[PDB]
Design an enzyme around this catalytic site. Structure first.
Site, PDB file in Angstrom:
ATOM      1  N   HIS A  41       1.115  -1.701   0.079  1.00 12.75           N
ATOM      2  CA  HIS A  41      -0.072  -0.331   0.004  1.00 12.75           C
ATOM      3  C   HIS A  41       1.154   1.099   0.199  1.00 12.75           C
ATOM      4  O   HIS A  41       0.290   2.213  -0.492  1.00 12.75           O
ATOM      5  CB  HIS A  41      -1.130   0.187   1.343  1.00 12.75           C
ATOM      6  CG  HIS A  41      -0.157   0.312   2.514  1.00 12.75           C
ATOM      7  ND1 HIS A  41      -0.333  -0.718   3.503  1.00 12.75           N
ATOM      8  CD2 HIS A  41      -0.210   1.460   3.092  1.00 12.75           C
ATOM      9  CE1 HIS A  41       0.061  -0.810   4.857  1.00 12.75           C
ATOM     10  NE2 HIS A  41       0.293   0.647   4.709  1.00 12.75           N
ATOM     11  N   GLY A 143       2.985   6.032  10.198  1.00 10.95           N
ATOM     12  CA  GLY A 143       4.093   5.524   9.622  1.00 10.95           C
ATOM     13  C   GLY A 143       4.919   3.713  10.091  1.00 10.95           C
ATOM     14  O   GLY A 143       6.158   3.591   9.711  1.00 10.95           O
ATOM     15  N   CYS A 145       3.927   1.025   9.229  1.00 10.33           N
ATOM     16  CA  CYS A 145       4.355  -0.512   8.511  1.00 10.33           C
ATOM     17  C   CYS A 145       5.156  -0.686   8.330  1.00 10.33           C
ATOM     18  O   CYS A 145       5.866   0.188   7.782  1.00 10.33           O
ATOM     19  CB  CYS A 145       3.097   0.003   7.326  1.00 10.33           C
ATOM     20  SG  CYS A 145       1.223  -0.536   8.000  1.00 10.33           S
TER      21      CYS A 145
END
Ligand SMILES: *[C@H](O)[C@H](C[C@@H]1CCNC1=O)NC(=O)[C@H](CC(C)C)NC(=O)OCc1ccccc1
Ligand code: NA
Lengths: 305, 307
Positions: A41, A143, A145
């Site tokens: 993503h 932040g 991920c």
């Protein structure tokens, strides 16, 4: 009178963390040899995340659209592909800090260490367990991920988790390093809930063995049970059934204490049926279920890497 | 956030900067860990003791009888030649002929009771595990340390700078642990002799309990809130009766950010804690715990819940 969670030393993983940016979306990547792994993503605008067509979004990206940085040092991207929910960015530099490693897909109940990272920079490390409902507890913020979970065995890092999302209850969900989610979750900003959770029976048993090793054994009883009868009873208390592999991984603790696995199962059964009767085990009024049999030996034995 | 209402986890600093400093130090058949910074290895002085010396050591006498060559220092597979040695309180400093290229920016600090730090537990110079500890008010720590763990260190990281605050030396009969700062001064009234030693009566770290109650509220659990009110003095009278540390105004100030984030004034959270002390939890849990947890600082809570 206690027993504490212990994470693996994180240094080998710290040396693999980078940041990956597309547009204004930044998250973490894992740099092993000449490939950076990160959540797909990263290619989404905030608006894309609502309902993404990842194949179409990726078609519009070229190598030069990806900013990969080790600290502030850019690594040039020379190829890209998508594998399930992870992106693999080939870079022109092999990471000199690459450890010996494997990618593994873990079972519910298994524990691992998480290296929480932000902007490619390691921030903290903690131990957690994959819940039976395929979520994990612990700290992840905006932040985070692309932060990974891992186990170490001797000198080989087994990566088992990459972080993708937070559910409404505050728990977290992610994939293995092949991009396959644990659980029924999808990487889009859609209504998703964690299912009903259960208690990790094999880990409770491990923790009862840890108690016995440390001389806290009031709960040992004079009964035994069959595995099938125990599994049927356990589910009535919202405990996971035991597998044959669970019986085997308790072998070493059973041997060390001389308490047969099925005898310990009978002792747990009486605790479930009768309660703790005002007593504690390893200083806890609650049965702990996030130590695996391996965690108990690793901590009582002083294993290094 | 920190993971929801079902639990609150200890989180340590990443250990890599410290891993690169760990070596093994052997004298005779006594082995433990050392910390290699620039061209000096720091380690517990009882490495110079035979198992028998440890029962009642006169350390100046033992050390004068040792030469550089009695110290075997190993970084991984490489021997480091010792070219000088000196003792600072309960720590030995071994000068070696090689600079550690992995030396981080660092400081030696002495921490206060109630403050937290990360421990990198090591055996034979090799990292084994990482976990977070609090310095108890009675200057012990609830660690996990086995034979061979001495010389393992505790630390915090700020930016790129490692502040070392603890080196491990011993286990008390109750199973808690005692050690020194990196100047070799024990935390608490303990000595590095293998004799049974008791700590002073421990107390609960009040400001940390309050921080953890704020973490519970942030994660959506408010069942323990009331609105009794209390003055700071009246709260401290009850806290002291229950063997809780006094709360200072300086603690109240450090709780400011969490109070602002949750909308609960610090003295209102004090009133909720007072009721928990007087009434107990009545079989309920807070963040998955049946006990009031006191090893998270206000800084630890903010770090995990918002950043
Ligand atoms: C140093 O590696 C070791 C760490 C202790 C040992 C067991 N768990 C720990 O944290 N400390 C000592 O060996 C220490 C040396 C004295 C000169 C201070 N002696 C000690 O801690 O005695 C207590 C003990 C309990 C259980 C096993 C061994 C020793
Ligand atoms: Na939770």
């Amino acid at each position: 009178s206690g027993f504490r969670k212990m994470a693996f030393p994180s240094g080998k993983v710290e040396g693999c963390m980078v940041q990956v940016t597309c547009g204004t979306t930044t998250l973490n990547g894992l740099w092993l040899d000449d490939v950076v792994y990160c959540p797909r993503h990263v290619i989404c605008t905030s608006e894309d995340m609502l309902n993404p067509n990842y194949e179409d979004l990726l078609i519009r990206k070229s190598n030069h659209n990806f900013l990969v940085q080790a600290g502030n040092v850019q690594l040039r991207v020379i190829g890209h592909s998508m594998q399930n929910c992870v992106l693999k960015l080939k870079v022109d530099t092999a990471n000199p800090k690459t450890p010996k490693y494997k990618f593994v897909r873990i079972q519910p109940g298994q524990t691992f260490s998480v290296l929480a990272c932000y902007n490619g920079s390691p921030s903290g490390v903690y131990q957690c367990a994959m819940r039976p409902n395929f979520t994990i507890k612990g700290s992840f913020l905006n932040g985070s991920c692309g932060s990974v979970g891992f186990n170490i065995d001797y000198d080989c890092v087994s990566f088992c988790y990459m972080h993708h999302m937070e559910l409404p209850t505050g728990v977290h969900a992610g994939t293995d390093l092949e991009g396959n989610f644990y659980g029924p979750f999808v990487d889009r900003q859609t209504a998703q809930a964690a299912g009903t959770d259960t208690t990790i029976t094999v880990n409770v048993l491990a923790w009862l063995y840890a108690a016995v090793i440390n001389g806290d054994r009031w709960f040992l009883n004079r009964f035994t049970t069959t595995l099938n009868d125990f599994n049927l009873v356990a589910m009535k208390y919202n405990y996971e059934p035991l597998t044959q592999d669970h019986v085997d991984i308790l072998g070493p603790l059973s041997a060390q204490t001389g308490i047969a696995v099925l005898d310990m199962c009978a002792s747990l059964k009486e605790l479930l049926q009768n309660g703790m009767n005002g007593r504690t085990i390893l200083g806890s009024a609650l049965l702990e279920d996030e130590f695996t049999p391996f965690d108990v030996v690793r901590q009582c034995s002083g294993v290094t890497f």
